[PDB]
Amino acid sequence: MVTKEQVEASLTSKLKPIHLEVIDISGGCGSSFEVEVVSEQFEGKRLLERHRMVNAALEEEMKEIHALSIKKAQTPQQWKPPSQDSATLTKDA
């Protein structure tokens, strides 16, 4: 059992305030959060180590919550200058 509110500040601390967006898509408060991370732990890194690195700092977190899904493990080098949300077609471009 956890709160997403502490998850908010927790990931920001252990992973650093780069790009974190976790959202309980399971229960209400405590439960399996879907995180979107863009941090330097994915920088020219291999996707597998990418997840294994984020959850390293979030594994303790995962033990207290129901689950933590890193839906996105990306760095500003592939993220590059923002041109992804545009091409989501949520505003055409």
Side-chain angles (χ1 to χ4, degrees), residues 57-89:
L58 264 58
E59 184 191 302
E60 50 192 76
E61 214 66 55
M62 189 183 302
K63 305 298 174 56
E64 185 162 81
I65 80 217
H66 278 290
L68 236 173
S69 317
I70 176 170
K71 316 292 289 298
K72 277 183 187 183
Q74 296 171 328
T75 16
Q77 112 261 213
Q78 306 124 145
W79 239 49
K80 45 74 70 175
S83 310
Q84 67 181 329
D85 170 78
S86 54
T88 307
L89 272 56

PDB file of all heavy atoms in Angstrom, residues 57-89:
ATOM      1  N   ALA A  57      16.101   1.835  -8.831  1.00  0.00           N
ATOM      2  CA  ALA A  57      15.831   2.930  -7.918  1.00  0.00           C
ATOM      3  C   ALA A  57      14.361   2.940  -7.529  1.00  0.00           C
ATOM      4  O   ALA A  57      13.930   3.714  -6.677  1.00  0.00           O
ATOM      5  CB  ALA A  57      16.211   4.243  -8.582  1.00  0.00           C
ATOM      6  N   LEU A  58      13.609   2.051  -8.155  1.00  0.00           N
ATOM      7  CA  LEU A  58      12.162   2.036  -8.040  1.00  0.00           C
ATOM      8  C   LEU A  58      11.672   0.661  -7.613  1.00  0.00           C
ATOM      9  O   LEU A  58      10.473   0.412  -7.535  1.00  0.00           O
ATOM     10  CB  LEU A  58      11.542   2.396  -9.388  1.00  0.00           C
ATOM     11  CG  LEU A  58      11.151   3.865  -9.597  1.00  0.00           C
ATOM     12  CD1 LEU A  58      12.350   4.787  -9.426  1.00  0.00           C
ATOM     13  CD2 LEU A  58      10.546   4.054 -10.981  1.00  0.00           C
ATOM     14  N   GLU A  59      12.609  -0.227  -7.344  1.00  0.00           N
ATOM     15  CA  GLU A  59      12.273  -1.609  -6.994  1.00  0.00           C
ATOM     16  C   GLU A  59      11.712  -1.645  -5.588  1.00  0.00           C
ATOM     17  O   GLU A  59      10.761  -2.366  -5.302  1.00  0.00           O
ATOM     18  CB  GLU A  59      13.490  -2.544  -7.097  1.00  0.00           C
ATOM     19  CG  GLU A  59      13.140  -4.000  -6.842  1.00  0.00           C
ATOM     20  CD  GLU A  59      14.353  -4.888  -6.691  1.00  0.00           C
ATOM     21  OE1 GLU A  59      15.182  -4.940  -7.621  1.00  0.00           O
ATOM     22  OE2 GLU A  59      14.482  -5.545  -5.636  1.00  0.00           O
ATOM     23  N   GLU A  60      12.296  -0.827  -4.733  1.00  0.00           N
ATOM     24  CA  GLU A  60      11.836  -0.671  -3.365  1.00  0.00           C
ATOM     25  C   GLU A  60      10.436  -0.090  -3.385  1.00  0.00           C
ATOM     26  O   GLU A  60       9.559  -0.456  -2.596  1.00  0.00           O
ATOM     27  CB  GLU A  60      12.798   0.260  -2.627  1.00  0.00           C
ATOM     28  CG  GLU A  60      13.083   1.554  -3.383  1.00  0.00           C
ATOM     29  CD  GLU A  60      14.237   2.327  -2.792  1.00  0.00           C
ATOM     30  OE1 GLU A  60      15.397   1.927  -3.015  1.00  0.00           O
ATOM     31  OE2 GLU A  60      13.992   3.341  -2.108  1.00  0.00           O
ATOM     32  N   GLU A  61      10.244   0.788  -4.346  1.00  0.00           N
ATOM     33  CA  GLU A  61       8.987   1.450  -4.557  1.00  0.00           C
ATOM     34  C   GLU A  61       7.957   0.428  -5.010  1.00  0.00           C
ATOM     35  O   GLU A  61       6.832   0.387  -4.519  1.00  0.00           O
ATOM     36  CB  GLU A  61       9.188   2.519  -5.622  1.00  0.00           C
ATOM     37  CG  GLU A  61       8.348   3.765  -5.408  1.00  0.00           C
ATOM     38  CD  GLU A  61       8.758   4.516  -4.158  1.00  0.00           C
ATOM     39  OE1 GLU A  61       9.953   4.854  -4.034  1.00  0.00           O
ATOM     40  OE2 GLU A  61       7.892   4.782  -3.301  1.00  0.00           O
ATOM     41  N   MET A  62       8.386  -0.427  -5.927  1.00  0.00           N
ATOM     42  CA  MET A  62       7.536  -1.461  -6.492  1.00  0.00           C
ATOM     43  C   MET A  62       7.080  -2.443  -5.424  1.00  0.00           C
ATOM     44  O   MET A  62       5.971  -2.967  -5.489  1.00  0.00           O
ATOM     45  CB  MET A  62       8.285  -2.193  -7.605  1.00  0.00           C
ATOM     46  CG  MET A  62       7.422  -3.146  -8.411  1.00  0.00           C
ATOM     47  SD  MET A  62       8.370  -4.038  -9.661  1.00  0.00           S
ATOM     48  CE  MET A  62       9.058  -2.678 -10.606  1.00  0.00           C
ATOM     49  N   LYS A  63       7.927  -2.668  -4.429  1.00  0.00           N
ATOM     50  CA  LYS A  63       7.604  -3.599  -3.352  1.00  0.00           C
ATOM     51  C   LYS A  63       6.480  -3.051  -2.481  1.00  0.00           C
ATOM     52  O   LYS A  63       5.778  -3.810  -1.813  1.00  0.00           O
ATOM     53  CB  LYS A  63       8.831  -3.871  -2.481  1.00  0.00           C
ATOM     54  CG  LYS A  63      10.041  -4.376  -3.248  1.00  0.00           C
ATOM     55  CD  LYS A  63       9.781  -5.708  -3.928  1.00  0.00           C
ATOM     56  CE  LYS A  63      10.955  -6.112  -4.808  1.00  0.00           C
ATOM     57  NZ  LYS A  63      12.239  -6.165  -4.054  1.00  0.00           N
ATOM     58  N   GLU A  64       6.307  -1.735  -2.500  1.00  0.00           N
ATOM     59  CA  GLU A  64       5.320  -1.098  -1.636  1.00  0.00           C
ATOM     60  C   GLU A  64       4.026  -0.837  -2.398  1.00  0.00           C
ATOM     61  O   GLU A  64       2.938  -0.789  -1.819  1.00  0.00           O
ATOM     62  CB  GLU A  64       5.889   0.196  -1.044  1.00  0.00           C
ATOM     63  CG  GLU A  64       4.974   0.858  -0.028  1.00  0.00           C
ATOM     64  CD  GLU A  64       5.702   1.850   0.853  1.00  0.00           C
ATOM     65  OE1 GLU A  64       5.927   2.999   0.419  1.00  0.00           O
ATOM     66  OE2 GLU A  64       6.064   1.483   1.989  1.00  0.00           O
ATOM     67  N   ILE A  65       4.151  -0.701  -3.704  1.00  0.00           N
ATOM     68  CA  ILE A  65       2.997  -0.493  -4.568  1.00  0.00           C
ATOM     69  C   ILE A  65       2.561  -1.839  -5.130  1.00  0.00           C
ATOM     70  O   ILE A  65       3.032  -2.874  -4.660  1.00  0.00           O
ATOM     71  CB  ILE A  65       3.319   0.501  -5.706  1.00  0.00           C
ATOM     72  CG1 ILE A  65       4.083  -0.195  -6.830  1.00  0.00           C
ATOM     73  CG2 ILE A  65       4.119   1.679  -5.154  1.00  0.00           C
ATOM     74  CD1 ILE A  65       5.160   0.652  -7.475  1.00  0.00           C
ATOM     75  N   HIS A  66       1.668  -1.866  -6.106  1.00  0.00           N
ATOM     76  CA  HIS A  66       1.275  -3.146  -6.675  1.00  0.00           C
ATOM     77  C   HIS A  66       2.136  -3.510  -7.878  1.00  0.00           C
ATOM     78  O   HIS A  66       2.369  -4.690  -8.146  1.00  0.00           O
ATOM     79  CB  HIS A  66      -0.211  -3.160  -7.017  1.00  0.00           C
ATOM     80  CG  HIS A  66      -1.047  -3.448  -5.822  1.00  0.00           C
ATOM     81  ND1 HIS A  66      -1.088  -4.678  -5.216  1.00  0.00           N
ATOM     82  CD2 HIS A  66      -1.832  -2.646  -5.085  1.00  0.00           C
ATOM     83  CE1 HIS A  66      -1.859  -4.610  -4.153  1.00  0.00           C
ATOM     84  NE2 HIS A  66      -2.323  -3.387  -4.051  1.00  0.00           N
ATOM     85  N   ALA A  67       2.647  -2.493  -8.561  1.00  0.00           N
ATOM     86  CA  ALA A  67       3.446  -2.675  -9.755  1.00  0.00           C
ATOM     87  C   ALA A  67       3.850  -1.316 -10.300  1.00  0.00           C
ATOM     88  O   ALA A  67       3.193  -0.310 -10.033  1.00  0.00           O
ATOM     89  CB  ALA A  67       2.681  -3.459 -10.808  1.00  0.00           C
ATOM     90  N   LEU A  68       4.935  -1.287 -11.030  1.00  0.00           N
ATOM     91  CA  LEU A  68       5.391  -0.070 -11.675  1.00  0.00           C
ATOM     92  C   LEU A  68       5.819  -0.371 -13.098  1.00  0.00           C
ATOM     93  O   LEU A  68       6.838  -1.028 -13.327  1.00  0.00           O
ATOM     94  CB  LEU A  68       6.552   0.538 -10.899  1.00  0.00           C
ATOM     95  CG  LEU A  68       6.352   1.988 -10.452  1.00  0.00           C
ATOM     96  CD1 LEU A  68       7.496   2.429  -9.554  1.00  0.00           C
ATOM     97  CD2 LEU A  68       6.239   2.907 -11.658  1.00  0.00           C
ATOM     98  N   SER A  69       5.036   0.097 -14.047  1.00  0.00           N
ATOM     99  CA  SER A  69       5.307  -0.157 -15.445  1.00  0.00           C
ATOM    100  C   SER A  69       5.973   1.049 -16.082  1.00  0.00           C
ATOM    101  O   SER A  69       5.359   2.108 -16.213  1.00  0.00           O
ATOM    102  CB  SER A  69       4.007  -0.471 -16.181  1.00  0.00           C
ATOM    103  OG  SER A  69       3.184  -1.344 -15.424  1.00  0.00           O
ATOM    104  N   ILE A  70       7.232   0.902 -16.464  1.00  0.00           N
ATOM    105  CA  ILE A  70       7.910   1.946 -17.195  1.00  0.00           C
ATOM    106  C   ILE A  70       7.580   1.797 -18.667  1.00  0.00           C
ATOM    107  O   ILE A  70       8.241   1.081 -19.418  1.00  0.00           O
ATOM    108  CB  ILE A  70       9.441   1.963 -16.943  1.00  0.00           C
ATOM    109  CG1 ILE A  70      10.117   3.023 -17.824  1.00  0.00           C
ATOM    110  CG2 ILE A  70      10.061   0.588 -17.159  1.00  0.00           C
ATOM    111  CD1 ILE A  70      11.561   3.281 -17.471  1.00  0.00           C
ATOM    112  N   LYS A  71       6.506   2.456 -19.052  1.00  0.00           N
ATOM    113  CA  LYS A  71       5.974   2.351 -20.397  1.00  0.00           C
ATOM    114  C   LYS A  71       6.928   2.989 -21.377  1.00  0.00           C
ATOM    115  O   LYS A  71       6.999   2.612 -22.548  1.00  0.00           O
ATOM    116  CB  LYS A  71       4.623   3.055 -20.476  1.00  0.00           C
ATOM    117  CG  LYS A  71       3.728   2.750 -19.291  1.00  0.00           C
ATOM    118  CD  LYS A  71       3.272   1.299 -19.286  1.00  0.00           C
ATOM    119  CE  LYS A  71       2.277   1.023 -20.402  1.00  0.00           C
ATOM    120  NZ  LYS A  71       1.042   1.838 -20.250  1.00  0.00           N
ATOM    121  N   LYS A  72       7.666   3.956 -20.876  1.00  0.00           N
ATOM    122  CA  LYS A  72       8.582   4.710 -21.693  1.00  0.00           C
ATOM    123  C   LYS A  72       9.894   4.925 -20.998  1.00  0.00           C
ATOM    124  O   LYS A  72       9.963   5.481 -19.900  1.00  0.00           O
ATOM    125  CB  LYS A  72       7.971   6.038 -22.109  1.00  0.00           C
ATOM    126  CG  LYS A  72       7.071   5.898 -23.314  1.00  0.00           C
ATOM    127  CD  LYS A  72       6.515   7.237 -23.766  1.00  0.00           C
ATOM    128  CE  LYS A  72       5.474   7.064 -24.860  1.00  0.00           C
ATOM    129  NZ  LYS A  72       4.979   8.369 -25.373  1.00  0.00           N
ATOM    130  N   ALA A  73      10.921   4.446 -21.651  1.00  0.00           N
ATOM    131  CA  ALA A  73      12.285   4.669 -21.224  1.00  0.00           C
ATOM    132  C   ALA A  73      13.044   5.331 -22.356  1.00  0.00           C
ATOM    133  O   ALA A  73      13.588   4.660 -23.239  1.00  0.00           O
ATOM    134  CB  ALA A  73      12.947   3.355 -20.832  1.00  0.00           C
ATOM    135  N   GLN A  74      13.100   6.649 -22.312  1.00  0.00           N
ATOM    136  CA  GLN A  74      13.670   7.420 -23.405  1.00  0.00           C
ATOM    137  C   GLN A  74      14.562   8.542 -22.889  1.00  0.00           C
ATOM    138  O   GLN A  74      14.401   9.010 -21.767  1.00  0.00           O
ATOM    139  CB  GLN A  74      12.545   7.988 -24.276  1.00  0.00           C
ATOM    140  CG  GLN A  74      11.718   6.912 -24.967  1.00  0.00           C
ATOM    141  CD  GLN A  74      10.485   7.454 -25.657  1.00  0.00           C
ATOM    142  OE1 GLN A  74       9.885   8.435 -25.217  1.00  0.00           O
ATOM    143  NE2 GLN A  74      10.098   6.819 -26.752  1.00  0.00           N
ATOM    144  N   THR A  75      15.551   8.902 -23.685  1.00  0.00           N
ATOM    145  CA  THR A  75      16.432  10.014 -23.383  1.00  0.00           C
ATOM    146  C   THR A  75      16.293  11.141 -24.393  1.00  0.00           C
ATOM    147  O   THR A  75      15.899  10.906 -25.540  1.00  0.00           O
ATOM    148  CB  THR A  75      17.874   9.541 -23.344  1.00  0.00           C
ATOM    149  OG1 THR A  75      17.949   8.255 -23.972  1.00  0.00           O
ATOM    150  CG2 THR A  75      18.373   9.482 -21.913  1.00  0.00           C
ATOM    151  N   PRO A  76      16.656  12.373 -23.978  1.00  0.00           N
ATOM    152  CA  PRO A  76      16.572  13.583 -24.814  1.00  0.00           C
ATOM    153  C   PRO A  76      17.358  13.491 -26.121  1.00  0.00           C
ATOM    154  O   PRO A  76      17.275  14.389 -26.951  1.00  0.00           O
ATOM    155  CB  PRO A  76      17.162  14.682 -23.927  1.00  0.00           C
ATOM    156  CG  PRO A  76      17.005  14.179 -22.539  1.00  0.00           C
ATOM    157  CD  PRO A  76      17.173  12.694 -22.630  1.00  0.00           C
ATOM    158  N   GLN A  77      18.150  12.437 -26.295  1.00  0.00           N
ATOM    159  CA  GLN A  77      18.899  12.271 -27.547  1.00  0.00           C
ATOM    160  C   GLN A  77      18.016  11.659 -28.644  1.00  0.00           C
ATOM    161  O   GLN A  77      18.189  11.954 -29.824  1.00  0.00           O
ATOM    162  CB  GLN A  77      20.183  11.451 -27.325  1.00  0.00           C
ATOM    163  CG  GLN A  77      20.199  10.067 -27.966  1.00  0.00           C
ATOM    164  CD  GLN A  77      19.860   8.990 -26.987  1.00  0.00           C
ATOM    165  OE1 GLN A  77      20.347   7.863 -27.063  1.00  0.00           O
ATOM    166  NE2 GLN A  77      18.995   9.334 -26.073  1.00  0.00           N
ATOM    167  N   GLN A  78      17.061  10.822 -28.247  1.00  0.00           N
ATOM    168  CA  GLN A  78      16.108  10.243 -29.192  1.00  0.00           C
ATOM    169  C   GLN A  78      14.811  11.004 -29.099  1.00  0.00           C
ATOM    170  O   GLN A  78      14.083  11.157 -30.079  1.00  0.00           O
ATOM    171  CB  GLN A  78      15.817   8.789 -28.870  1.00  0.00           C
ATOM    172  CG  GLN A  78      17.033   7.895 -28.755  1.00  0.00           C
ATOM    173  CD  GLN A  78      17.067   7.214 -27.415  1.00  0.00           C
ATOM    174  OE1 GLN A  78      17.487   6.072 -27.283  1.00  0.00           O
ATOM    175  NE2 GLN A  78      16.656   7.950 -26.397  1.00  0.00           N
ATOM    176  N   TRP A  79      14.521  11.439 -27.880  1.00  0.00           N
ATOM    177  CA  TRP A  79      13.439  12.358 -27.625  1.00  0.00           C
ATOM    178  C   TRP A  79      13.684  13.594 -28.439  1.00  0.00           C
ATOM    179  O   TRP A  79      12.767  14.151 -29.043  1.00  0.00           O
ATOM    180  CB  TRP A  79      13.432  12.726 -26.146  1.00  0.00           C
ATOM    181  CG  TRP A  79      12.164  12.373 -25.465  1.00  0.00           C
ATOM    182  CD1 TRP A  79      11.528  11.178 -25.524  1.00  0.00           C
ATOM    183  CD2 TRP A  79      11.378  13.213 -24.617  1.00  0.00           C
ATOM    184  NE1 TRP A  79      10.388  11.220 -24.778  1.00  0.00           N
ATOM    185  CE2 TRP A  79      10.271  12.459 -24.203  1.00  0.00           C
ATOM    186  CE3 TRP A  79      11.506  14.529 -24.166  1.00  0.00           C
ATOM    187  CZ2 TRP A  79       9.289  12.976 -23.360  1.00  0.00           C
ATOM    188  CZ3 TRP A  79      10.532  15.043 -23.331  1.00  0.00           C
ATOM    189  CH2 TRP A  79       9.439  14.267 -22.936  1.00  0.00           C
ATOM    190  N   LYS A  80      14.974  13.938 -28.487  1.00  0.00           N
ATOM    191  CA  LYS A  80      15.499  15.128 -29.168  1.00  0.00           C
ATOM    192  C   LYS A  80      14.552  16.363 -29.059  1.00  0.00           C
ATOM    193  O   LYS A  80      13.664  16.367 -28.204  1.00  0.00           O
ATOM    194  CB  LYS A  80      15.918  14.727 -30.603  1.00  0.00           C
ATOM    195  CG  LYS A  80      14.924  13.856 -31.369  1.00  0.00           C
ATOM    196  CD  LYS A  80      13.695  14.621 -31.849  1.00  0.00           C
ATOM    197  CE  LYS A  80      14.030  15.592 -32.972  1.00  0.00           C
ATOM    198  NZ  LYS A  80      12.814  16.258 -33.513  1.00  0.00           N
ATOM    199  N   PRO A  81      14.768  17.487 -29.801  1.00  0.00           N
ATOM    200  CA  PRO A  81      13.794  18.591 -29.796  1.00  0.00           C
ATOM    201  C   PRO A  81      12.368  18.088 -30.021  1.00  0.00           C
ATOM    202  O   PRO A  81      12.113  17.319 -30.952  1.00  0.00           O
ATOM    203  CB  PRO A  81      14.267  19.472 -30.948  1.00  0.00           C
ATOM    204  CG  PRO A  81      15.741  19.290 -30.939  1.00  0.00           C
ATOM    205  CD  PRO A  81      15.960  17.836 -30.615  1.00  0.00           C
ATOM    206  N   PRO A  82      11.426  18.520 -29.159  1.00  0.00           N
ATOM    207  CA  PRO A  82      10.069  17.960 -29.103  1.00  0.00           C
ATOM    208  C   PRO A  82       9.368  17.947 -30.456  1.00  0.00           C
ATOM    209  O   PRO A  82       9.130  18.997 -31.062  1.00  0.00           O
ATOM    210  CB  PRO A  82       9.328  18.887 -28.123  1.00  0.00           C
ATOM    211  CG  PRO A  82      10.203  20.083 -27.961  1.00  0.00           C
ATOM    212  CD  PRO A  82      11.606  19.603 -28.184  1.00  0.00           C
ATOM    213  N   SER A  83       9.039  16.748 -30.922  1.00  0.00           N
ATOM    214  CA  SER A  83       8.339  16.566 -32.187  1.00  0.00           C
ATOM    215  C   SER A  83       7.614  15.226 -32.190  1.00  0.00           C
ATOM    216  O   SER A  83       7.486  14.572 -33.222  1.00  0.00           O
ATOM    217  CB  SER A  83       9.321  16.622 -33.364  1.00  0.00           C
ATOM    218  OG  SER A  83      10.158  17.764 -33.295  1.00  0.00           O
ATOM    219  N   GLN A  84       7.130  14.831 -31.028  1.00  0.00           N
ATOM    220  CA  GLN A  84       6.518  13.518 -30.870  1.00  0.00           C
ATOM    221  C   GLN A  84       5.047  13.648 -30.514  1.00  0.00           C
ATOM    222  O   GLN A  84       4.214  12.872 -30.981  1.00  0.00           O
ATOM    223  CB  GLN A  84       7.244  12.719 -29.789  1.00  0.00           C
ATOM    224  CG  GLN A  84       7.081  13.293 -28.398  1.00  0.00           C
ATOM    225  CD  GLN A  84       7.818  12.497 -27.357  1.00  0.00           C
ATOM    226  OE1 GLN A  84       7.973  11.283 -27.474  1.00  0.00           O
ATOM    227  NE2 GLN A  84       8.280  13.177 -26.333  1.00  0.00           N
ATOM    228  N   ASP A  85       4.738  14.647 -29.698  1.00  0.00           N
ATOM    229  CA  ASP A  85       3.374  14.866 -29.237  1.00  0.00           C
ATOM    230  C   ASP A  85       2.565  15.464 -30.359  1.00  0.00           C
ATOM    231  O   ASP A  85       1.364  15.228 -30.505  1.00  0.00           O
ATOM    232  CB  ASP A  85       3.361  15.783 -28.013  1.00  0.00           C
ATOM    233  CG  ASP A  85       1.965  16.232 -27.642  1.00  0.00           C
ATOM    234  OD1 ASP A  85       1.223  15.440 -27.030  1.00  0.00           O
ATOM    235  OD2 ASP A  85       1.602  17.382 -27.971  1.00  0.00           O
ATOM    236  N   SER A  86       3.274  16.208 -31.166  1.00  0.00           N
ATOM    237  CA  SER A  86       2.741  16.791 -32.368  1.00  0.00           C
ATOM    238  C   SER A  86       2.335  15.683 -33.329  1.00  0.00           C
ATOM    239  O   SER A  86       1.197  15.624 -33.799  1.00  0.00           O
ATOM    240  CB  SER A  86       3.820  17.680 -32.980  1.00  0.00           C
ATOM    241  OG  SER A  86       5.026  16.954 -33.163  1.00  0.00           O
ATOM    242  N   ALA A  87       3.266  14.764 -33.554  1.00  0.00           N
ATOM    243  CA  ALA A  87       3.053  13.644 -34.453  1.00  0.00           C
ATOM    244  C   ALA A  87       2.299  12.512 -33.768  1.00  0.00           C
ATOM    245  O   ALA A  87       2.340  11.366 -34.209  1.00  0.00           O
ATOM    246  CB  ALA A  87       4.381  13.148 -35.004  1.00  0.00           C
ATOM    247  N   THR A  88       1.622  12.833 -32.678  1.00  0.00           N
ATOM    248  CA  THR A  88       0.710  11.891 -32.056  1.00  0.00           C
ATOM    249  C   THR A  88      -0.646  12.010 -32.737  1.00  0.00           C
ATOM    250  O   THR A  88      -1.455  11.081 -32.733  1.00  0.00           O
ATOM    251  CB  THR A  88       0.567  12.135 -30.537  1.00  0.00           C
ATOM    252  OG1 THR A  88       1.860  12.172 -29.920  1.00  0.00           O
ATOM    253  CG2 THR A  88      -0.268  11.044 -29.881  1.00  0.00           C
ATOM    254  N   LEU A  89      -0.859  13.196 -33.308  1.00  0.00           N
ATOM    255  CA  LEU A  89      -2.024  13.511 -34.126  1.00  0.00           C
ATOM    256  C   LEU A  89      -3.142  13.913 -33.207  1.00  0.00           C
ATOM    257  O   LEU A  89      -4.321  13.863 -33.543  1.00  0.00           O
ATOM    258  CB  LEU A  89      -2.431  12.361 -35.060  1.00  0.00           C
ATOM    259  CG  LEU A  89      -1.750  12.350 -36.436  1.00  0.00           C
ATOM    260  CD1 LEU A  89      -0.235  12.334 -36.302  1.00  0.00           C
ATOM    261  CD2 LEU A  89      -2.216  11.151 -37.246  1.00  0.00           C
TER     262      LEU A  89
END
